[PDB]
Write a protein that binds this ligand. Structure first.
Ligand SMILES: [Zn+2]
Lengths: 219, 329, 241, 331
DNA sequence: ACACCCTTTCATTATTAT
């Protein structure tokens, strides 16, 4: 059907360090749908490839989904979210005195350990997310209608999806190739933005054990 | 499952921000160099998109409490008010890993990756507290999203959506509050004032002479011991305004919703985002819409009885060994 | 050169400590290297102490550290690579801003590996991928992974040099934070807002946050000419041995 | 522990807001430049979202006393009246850094980033005074939270909630008060008046010629600073009913007993500032201890267990905890 | 005897906008 999906989001999201693929989001949504039906005790890797998406086969194995990484049209200047992880030293001292916490150590350490006060700064963008793919319009729309947030750090409320629209587009108009592609991919599909890296082309894109020599663009 | 918590800050809100911010004696924030500037620590603000007065959207400064802060506040009020009293009632104790997992989501019990079977992932995700946040060595994804505390304000209108145009504040929601640290040795005035001090007058005069020596040293330096005289500023969010707070449970059990409901019941003692010595962050809960159904009364929550009963059967069935096997193995 | 732990055998040559076990059964990837520990490969049970805070960047839950990552987790190899690029010939330092100018403009053509510390010492090297192509660099900085494009870096430098021709005082278009920690990291300055075209403002917004962090070390007033860092692989080999 | 006390200031409140504020001779606040403006030191105003009209909630001024000022007032009250009398009546004595830690929170600037021990933190938050005001070089979290002093006003209606709709003020709440600062020797009129001055008429006339030269220099500058300084300061009007919300997160019995003893010794203390003008004098007409009214005119006359606990704990008060609180790990 | 805990210990730059 060769369609393009765009997403607008009320909350800003984490700016993705690597490529936010549409097939990754659809795989996580299908995994959540399978958890809704088949209970929480499922293998997520059984259903994360059960997508309304065509599959491109490289000449030597190495199939990828026909989706693309989300391109960002920035509505806002890029800002930075400071966040901290601090275990409450006062509450831990009270629990250690009362014996609810069984800690023999008398001194905390903010440099490292359980009481490491840690600071970390993640980039923030509010934008329009455009992804080009090859898939059935009806299947994607239901998955993205079950989608509430996009991007990372969704436990702290970031990147709440205000809405989305899924619309057909011409065959030469959409590049779905802006995507983590294998090294033996078709040179028609490979543009100047695609470069060699150690990256996942599929599935769990964070799984460093699944990273391959890939031709991927830059977010 | 969606929970909307509408709160009203009784005291100012101050979620401190990083960066070197400065302010003059007048309220000019970040003055250009070549003038007397003072250290300022502002509230947590992010730029958000808003369309007020025009169809297009512009980046406006919205002063919020982060979702990480409210997430840890929900976690800590469930621990302080439901989880730890129940565990003390059964007489159960927590280890270092179970405490750093339950109270901070930290993986310091097993820093090395801990493998969890999909079945035990399901059972711990069905736990009333563990499935809400996850964390620990397993890094379980929680059932719970805790959004940022958004002020009901025209800047937040894209985040708020419809249904909040009434009681919507406008303009600046912040104020620079000035705080100084007096040197109490300078306020010593009599022998009876100073005779609680070892040495008394001689030690007091030694402090005075050390302070004047440091002042002359700083004056000659301008043309590293810091004294107790300080004068600084902190931007707060003004009291009395209204905030929304989104808590979405991703396919929960009834006991997890009951635990969040017990948190909202006992949360009136807690404080939002710190500023602890100045009593900052004290609030009252004005409304709780449970999937859009208003459930908050003045005395806690009336109704929602299946969640309260499920969390009751959870907390009489709650022991620490679930937390130990969630942390260690 | 396929995994980051290949900076232990191919470069910064070292062997196993020989108090390590031999892997048995089905193969599992290392928790740190992301390298598959095959049968007959030396491995350790994961004896990470409680001060190890990099569980989020562990590749697998196998609790099995490969011997190459045991060498990678050595404290001399930790602090010795607090600012380093590891090419196929040797390790070079990127502590100076001229060294980061050489790293991010005209980089070496090897499959190198860029590690940098946002603090005193962090478990830094094993969690970051190797940069096989020159034009896409996987930088590790503190707790975050970063992606830097050298050609976009030179384009931003050409714009920044062009907008300050004929001016006595060098004024930056956009503030970038070296710690990548300020809220204004990525915020464009009012001189840059009044000077840069909107296409160039969207260009400086369109770069990756790793490129913003890199440009922070190379948008300062005393503009760094790209100069190679001194080779420190003898230094960290002596510190390791 | 949610102490809500209500006071009545019988004398104006001057919590001086830092700024560069001016006023005309008529009383217009911060006039446009060019007109003759006098210096004005405004009282501490907060902004507050309040209900003006019907649902037209707006950020309006409400002039208050800061919670830092009221916190230090409570601290110095329980110090000068409870802690130090019980610490002098026995042989205990503090170092100058320990006095500085007990009053200003810290013994110096430049704190140590090394934290404190868990047993240390538990014992210090179990202390009657240290757990209320946890300062020190290693920064404790003191369990006392002190609110700002809010006037019971319609502009604080969202803050106060319910139970204050009577005895609530409205409209203007402040007043500009002017001060002359007249030169003393202009009042000199006779040789009997000048006999205390060295030289008598000679030094007085010399200061007069110096004043004339300074006035001529100031006229030349318009078209060294004298003793004539006419100025203004905005105060809060007296007779107001104010509220003050002490709170304590899971207190020891002795700590809230110490807060009750400081509130019972709040008589003849000045709230913020204007010492010479007696500003800040107040009468407490209410104390509620988790909502129950525990203030008579004679004193508290309630909450007895808190008072016995703080009596037993200032009986056991010593300087050792203060000294090990003030002791820096770096120093 | 091994997990838990308390101290050294070592790495290198560098300017700053709002
Ligand atoms: Zn490994």
């Amino acid at each position: 059907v060769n369609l393009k999906v765009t997403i607008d989001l009320s909350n800003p999201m984490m700016e993705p360090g690597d490529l936010l693929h549409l097939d990754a989001l659809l795989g996580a949504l299908r995994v959540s749908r399978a958890r809704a039906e088949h209970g929480d005790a499922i293998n997520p890797r059984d259903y994360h490839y059960d997508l309304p998406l065509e599959r491109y086969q490289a000449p030597s194995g190495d199939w990828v989904f026909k989706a693309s990484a989300f391109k960002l049209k920035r509505q806002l200047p890029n800002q930075m979210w400071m966040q901290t992880g601090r275990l409450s030293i006062v509450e831990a001292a009270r629990h250690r005195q009362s014996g609810y916490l069984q800690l023999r150590a008398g001194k905390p350490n903010p440099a490292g350990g359980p009481f490491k006060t840690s600071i970390y700064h993640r980039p923030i963008v509010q934008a329009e997310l455009t992804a080009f793919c090859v898939g059935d319009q009806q299947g994607i729309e239901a998955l993205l209608s079950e989608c509430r947030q996009i991007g990372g750090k969704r436990g702290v409320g970031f990147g709440q999806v205000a809405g989305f629209k899924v619309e057909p587009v011409a065959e030469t108009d959409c590049p779905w190739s802006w995507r983590a592609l294998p090294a033996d991919a078709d040179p028609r599909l490979v543009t100047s933005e695609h470069a060699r890296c150690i990256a996942a082309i599929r599935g769990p894109y964070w799984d460093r054990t699944l990273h391959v020599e890939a031709l991927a663009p830059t977010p | 499952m969606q929970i909307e918590v509408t709160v009203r800050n009784i005291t100012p809100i101050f979620s401190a921000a990083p960066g070197s911010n400065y302010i003059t004696i007048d309220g000019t924030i970040n003055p250009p160099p070549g003038v007397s500037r003072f250290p300022l620590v502002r509230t947590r603000m992010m730029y958000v998109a808003a369309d007020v007065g025009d169809g297009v959207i512009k980046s406006v400064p919205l002063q919020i409490v982060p979702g990480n802060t409210m997430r840890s506040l929900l976690r800590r009020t469930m621990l302080k008010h439901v989880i730890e009293p129940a565990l003390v009632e059964k007489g159960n104790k927590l280890s270092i890993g179970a405490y750093a997992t339950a109270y901070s989501g930290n993986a310091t019990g097993n820093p090395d990756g801990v493998p969890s079977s999909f079945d035990e992932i399901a059972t711990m995700r069905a736990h009333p507290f563990i499935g809400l946040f996850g964390g620990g060595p397993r890094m379980l994804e929680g059932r719970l999203m805790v959004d940022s505390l958004y002020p009901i304000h025209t800047n937040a209108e894209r985040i708020l959506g419809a249904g909040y145009e009434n009681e919507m504040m406008s303009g600046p929601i912040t104020q620079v509050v000035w705080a100084r640290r007096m040197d109490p040795i300078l306020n010593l005035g009599s022998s009876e004032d100073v005779e609680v001090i070892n040495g008394g007058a001689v030690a007091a005069n030694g402090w005075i002479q050390d302070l004047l020596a440091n002042s002359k040293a700083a004056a000659s330096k301008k043309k590293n011991g810091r004294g107790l005289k300080a004068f600084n500023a902190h931007e707060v969010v003004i009291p009395g305004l209204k905030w929304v707070w989104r808590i979405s449970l991703d396919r929960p059990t009834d006991a997890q919703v009951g635990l969040v409901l017990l948190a909202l019941n006992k949360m009136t003692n807690e404080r939002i985002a710190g500023g602890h010595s100045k009593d900052y962050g004290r609030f009252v809960i004005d409304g709780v819409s449970l999937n859009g159904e208003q459930v908050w009364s003045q005395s806690g929550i009336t109704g929602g009885e299946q969640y309260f009963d499920a969390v009751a059967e959870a907390i009489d069935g709650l022991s620490s060994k679930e937390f130990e096997q969630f942390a260690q193995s | 050169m396929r995994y980051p732990s290949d900076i232990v055998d191919q470069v910064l040559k070292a062997g196993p400590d020989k108090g390590l076990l031999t892997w048995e059964g089905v193969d599992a990837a290392c928790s740190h290297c992301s390298r598959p520990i095959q049968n007959g490969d030396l491995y350790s049970p994961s004896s990470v102490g409680a001060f190890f805070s990099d569980t989020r960047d562990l590749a697998s839950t196998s609790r099995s550290i490969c011997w190459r990552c045991v060498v990678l987790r050595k404290k001399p190899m930790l602090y010795g690579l607090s600012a380093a690029v590891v090419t196929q010939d040797g390790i070079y330092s990127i502590s100076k801003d001229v060294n980061k100018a050489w790293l991010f403009t005209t980089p070496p053509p090897a499959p190198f590996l860029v590690v940098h510390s946002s603090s005193t010492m962090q478990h830094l090297s094993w969690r970051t991928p190797v940069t096989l192509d020159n034009r896409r660099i996987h930088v590790r900085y503190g707790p975050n992974l970063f992606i830097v494009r050298p050609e976009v870096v030179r384009k931003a430098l050409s714009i920044a040099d062009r907008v300050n021709e004929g001016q006595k005082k060098w004024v930056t278009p956009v503030y970038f934070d070296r710690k990548a920690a300020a809220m204004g990291h990525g915020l464009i300055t009012r001189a840059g807002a009044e000077m840069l075209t909107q296409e160039e403002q969207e260009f400086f917004q369109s770069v990756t946050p790793g490129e913003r962090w890199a440009l922070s070390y190379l948008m300062h007033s005393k503009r760094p000419e790209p100069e190679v860092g001194e080779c420190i692989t003898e230094k960290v080999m002596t510190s390791l041995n």
